[PDB]
Design a protein around this ligand. Structure first.
Ligand SMILES: O=C(O)CNC(=O)C(=O)O
Ligand SMILES: [Mg+2]
Ligand code: NI
Ligand SMILES: [Zn+2]
Length: 331
């Protein structure tokens, strides 16, 4: 069995290996990369996502989200308070202000310590979940707006044509902006490219151990757990590495820098934080190996998780028994 300790693997494809996206994902899996839940892909030195980032300041962040925490430093929830619209140039200036900027630090490890110690005492503002793309249309390799669609994959594997579309999303971050512990909708893959700016730190639980993280979360968030049998779908709960280690939960950590891709694999729980002003692009995708995870994915039916139009068909075809109850949650 390849990668039996479930370590995060890092790949360096050549420009020739970078042509065929599906083939390269299958290669990484042949080496055991999925067992970690997360892999890093460093693009060939010849590749670029676009020529420059000099002309992005006029993108609008229609609904910036202020991330307000409750709890204790290693075990907390966050809610999102909607703020007034602002442009990317306005948001960059805000990120660089004395109130919001990254503090002085020695290295990534010192910054990680300061994040876990201090996050709860501040409410950073995240420009998350913005439909769009920063890849140039002429970039042919690993262009997240030109991938094979999940609907087309389900059709190729299962023979059923379904409605729905699959487009990328932009994330503009600042120091301390946070992504809570989650897997993807329908336990899909995700791919995330860090276009510019400061790093993003990731934590991940191997898929084979995901239920250990769920059982800890039910213990640590006991009211949430009574409210919903899949409350991590709400994407609100944070648990620190120190707390995970104290409770024996297997995990790994890695920092992504500008110009690097990360792939999350089906049922790989992940969480993390941004080091300073940055922009990332991400999209979900599927492979044949996903189908069995999609059939078994948990679902939130309490009404909180509220998701895209395109998830309807995935539930309806892959999970027909659950369909009725899940749709009640969505309406
Ligand atoms: O970058 C972020 O805030 C969150 N991203 C992801 O969870 C992802 O790409 O799967
Ligand atoms: Mg612009
Ligand atoms: Ni994710
Ligand atoms: Zn729920």
């Amino acid at each position: 069995a390849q990668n039996p300790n479930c370590n995060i693997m890092i790949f360096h494809p050549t420009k020739e290996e970078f042509n065929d996206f599906d083939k390269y994902i299958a290669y990484m899996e042949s080496q055991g990369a999925h067992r970690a839940g997360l892999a890093k892909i460093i693009p060939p030195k010849e590749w670029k996502a676009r020529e420059t980032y000099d002309n992005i300041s006029e993108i609008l962040i229609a609904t910036p989200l202020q991330q307000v925490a409750s709890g204790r430093a290693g075990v907390f929830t966050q809610y999102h308070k909607k703020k007034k619209a602002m442009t990317v140039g306005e948001y960059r200036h805000l990120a660089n202000s004395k109130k919001y900027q990254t503090p002085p630090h020695q290295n990534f490890e010192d910054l990680e310590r300061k994040y876990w110690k201090n996050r709860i005492y501040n409410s950073p503002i995240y420009g998350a979940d913005i439909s769009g793309s920063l890849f140039d249309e002429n970039t042919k390799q690993w262009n997240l707006g030109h991938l094979g669609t999940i609907q087309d994959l389900l059709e190729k594997e299962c023979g059923v044509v379904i409605e729905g579309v699959n487009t990328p999303y932009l994330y503009f971050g600042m120091w301390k902006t946070t992504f809570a512990w989650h897997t993807e909708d329908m336990d899909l893959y995700s791919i995330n490219y860090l276009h510019l700016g400061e790093p993003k730190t990731w934590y991940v639980v191997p898929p084979e151990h995901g239920q250990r993280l769920e059982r800890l979360a039910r213990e640590l968030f006991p009211g949430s757990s009574r409210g919903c049998g899949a409350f991590l779908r709400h994407k609100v709960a944070l648990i620190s590495p120190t707390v995970l280690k104290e409770n024996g939960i297997p995990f790994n950590r890695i920092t992504q820098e500008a110009g690097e891709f990360m792939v999350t694999f089906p049922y790989g729980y992940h969480a993390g934080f941004n080091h300073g002003f940055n922009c990332a692009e991400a999209i979900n995708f599927a492979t044949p190996r996903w189908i069995d995870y999609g059939k078994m994915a948990s679902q939130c039916s309490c009404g909180e998780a509220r998701v895209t139009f395109s998830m309807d068909a995935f539930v309806r075809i892959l999970q027909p028994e659950r369909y009725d109850l899940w749709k009640r949650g969505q309406d």
